[PDB]
Amino acid sequence: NQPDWADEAANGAHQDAWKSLKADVENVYYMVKATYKNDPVWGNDFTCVGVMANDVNEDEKSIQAEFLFMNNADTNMQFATEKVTAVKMYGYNRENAFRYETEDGQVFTDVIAYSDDNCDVIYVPGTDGNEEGYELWTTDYDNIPANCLNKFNEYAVGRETRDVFTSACLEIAAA
């Protein structure tokens, strides 16, 4: 059993996990929307999630990712570092998933449902002690690409979508 969009022949061209992970090195990615409220690491009613990477390791298809996030337990922005590795899921031959590993050794494996140059639609299977659902990540939290947004809305149909990282996360400007 696997999601109907998890068809490598049909959709693999837009499910390149390693390319998507390496993209975190040049630009910060913001999780702009999701269909679930709680994450074991980011917290409850989490918002303002962003990520940037460094230390690309081609041999391992891994990066060291630095995250920022907020939740209802603290008014201040929170930060964490996790290793993320491009791995295979759903029988794919080319890596289509992200294996996150926290400093405490906790592992989460999420799957790229759709990805374009500056945005990703990610599926959380819900088997890592977490809620099953979808996430939408983009490099510009104010200008969301239509292709990814449409794919996110298509795959996430029947759920409750909510904003995660928005301009409300920051107090921009001066005086």
Q: Does 46 bind ligand HSM (CB under 6 A)?
A: no
Q: Does 56 bind ligand HSM (CB under 6 A)?
A: no
CA distance 39 to 132: 10
Give the torsion through C-alpha atoms of 81, 84, 90, 93, to 10 deg. 170
Q: Does 95 bind ligand HSM (CB under 6 A)?
A: no
Which residue, among 79, 70, 74, 80, has the nearest Cα to 37 in the 3D structure? 70
Q: Are 69 and 76 in contact (CB under 8 A)?
A: no
Q: Does 18 bind ligand HSM (CB under 6 A)?
A: no
Q: Does 164 bind ligand HSM (CB under 6 A)?
A: no
Q: Does 20 bind ligand HSM (CB under 6 A)?
A: yes
Residues making contact with ligand HSM (CB under 6 A): 20-21, 23-24, 29, 39, 41-42, 51, 65, 82, 84, 98, 100, 108, 110, 120, 124, 137
